[PDB]
Symmetry: C3
Subunit: 186 residues, 3 copies
């Protein structure tokens, strides 16, 4: 009756089984992730080869944040240090604007969230978008960084380990969808 | 603080040995605890079966904050996530209003797995709880749960009107105090079967 | 092309080979350390027997912070709890004024854990015009000898790499002090 991570994954798995078009899998899954997390805006961001990227799916609750679907953002928005954490540690990151802190959890039992001061450039970036809470988990295809699952909220909120676990399961299942689609299409 | 925490424990034990009514043991103890911690308001909060609760003992320094003795608070003040941390991890919590952070230290932690004693880890605290404390004029809150056998029985609550830092040693003191109260409570239950 | 920790240590080692007076090694070193770390003010603080201390060397970028060279500070500026962390854990400390947090990293034999910093210390730093402080202890054999202090007038983030550089520098200074004691032995 209520949405859980298990039922969201079961539907992604069925979509893969039916060989639905990958872009449609990504679009439909993004909407369920937003419903599951309850946040104002959930996006899937896909990297280009030069490290810039594009918002390729987006689900927004009640027009509470602007639509970024289709927009491109430069490589420099994610500096080398942050990018390295994504690639090598598969870090999940929670930004809390009100406290000026970022909480990071590698995948590598190292799944206790450790909070530290976040760079003011990134705080200012989020504030300009009207975002008070950001949660990001990277998406891989095989061993390569493919994109990001991004959750934005217009108000302060707390983020639990269970929520990061749900996001991690979802990006792991999307990785399977992406790899299977590549295999099916040559 | 350590020569003092030991004396607080001894004084509780003396009351148990003299066969004081549990309510009197609890009342007399909060004043000695406040003196030890030095904070403006120390309370013992007792849970009702429905998860609401009541302030059943209180000691305040120089009327610095209003008295909450006898007041009831609804279950909703402690939502399920928070309550589960209390029940399953026996978490001790330090709220620092100025930074908007809450520090939590389990005594023993993870679900149906090995439970391990930790260091204090700080994270952003929910704005509702910050607003709740700020409405009372509280800048620092420290809470340790009281158990009777496996049941969450109550809380030892320490409020202060000014910013402060809280050390491991202070949490350790609070932990010994709630462990000693738990003994008084268990003995009383056995005597009133 | 740029300064790294390895070349900074090689020059400290060369100064040791010249049997320069310890104060002169330390004076000659602080400027390169500031250029390496990039902060507004780097100081070496030497403890007196009663726990008070003196700024015995200092390098400042473009007068961005006042000069504290030669000034003495009382023992109580560093309370027993803080002093014990220095002595027993060789703790490195990062204070972030904007968030009101202090991050501490032991040397041990884990990462940086942030907690609220005492408001007395916040006020101490603010009164100096400091928004970022990073401190690592200096030892001689097993005795706490002084501090390497890095101050900045603007908020910033501090990485593990910066702590590693500071740790290499205070370890090399410990060698300079020990060698100096042996060479000046009666
Ligand atoms: C300053 C002049 C730079 C800049 C600096 C930084 N960005 C940092 C982290 C970061 N940025 C993103 C952007 C990504 N998040 C979004 O919401 C969107 C747009 C929809 C994008 C493209 C991400 C994912 C990250 C990683 C952290 C996170 O997951 O939130 C960063 C590190 C901050 C820290 O860890 O302390 C810095 C210094 N960003 C700018 O835009 C300008 C060019
Ligand atoms: C929001 C609309 C809710 C609400 C939400 C939360 N309360 C949280 C934690 C919490 N609350 C108490 C209350 C307890 N402390 C006191 O001082 C008193 C009264 C004297 C009482 C009854 C406690 C003990 C706790 C646990 C945290 C702690 O030990 O301080 C909470 C979680 C915060 C977090 O951990 O991030 C939330 C979201 N509280 C409300 O009053 C309204 C109805
Ligand atoms: C309050 C009435 C006291 C007082 C209290 C505290 N000082 C704390 C830590 C601390 N202080 C220093 C001083 C040292 N840093 C400098 O920049 C200089 C001078 C240029 C000096 C002499 C250090 C090194 C430390 C350790 C932490 C750090 O490395 O930054 C402290 C603990 C803070 C905390 O950990 O929460 C307290 C409570 N300081 C005062 O000046 C007055 C007398």
């Amino acid at each position: 009756v209520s949405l859980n991570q298990e039922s969201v994954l079961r539907r992604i798995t069925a979509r893969i089984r039916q060989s639905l078009e990958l872009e449609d899998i990504i679009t439909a899954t993004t909407a369920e992730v937003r419903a599951l997390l309850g946040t104002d805006r959930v996006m899937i961001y896909k990297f280009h080869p030069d490290g810039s990227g594009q918002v390729i799916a987006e689900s927004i609750h009640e027009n509470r944040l602007p639509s970024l679907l289709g927009l491109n953002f430069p490589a420099d928005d994610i500096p080398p240090q942050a990018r390295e954490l994504l690639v090598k540690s598969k870090v999940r990151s929670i930004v809390d604007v009100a406290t000026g802190m970022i909480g990071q959890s590698p995948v590598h039992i190292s799944e206790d969230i450790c909070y530290r001061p976040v760079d003011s450039c990134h705080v200012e970036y989020l504030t300009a978008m009207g975002v008070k809470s950001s949660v990001v988990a990277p998406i891989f295809c095989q061993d390569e960084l493919w994109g990001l699952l991004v959750s934005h909220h217009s108000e302060n909120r707390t983020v639990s380990e269970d929520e990061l676990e749900a996001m991690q399961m979802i990006v792991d299942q999307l990785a399977v969808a992406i790899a299977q689609s590549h295999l099916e299409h040559h």
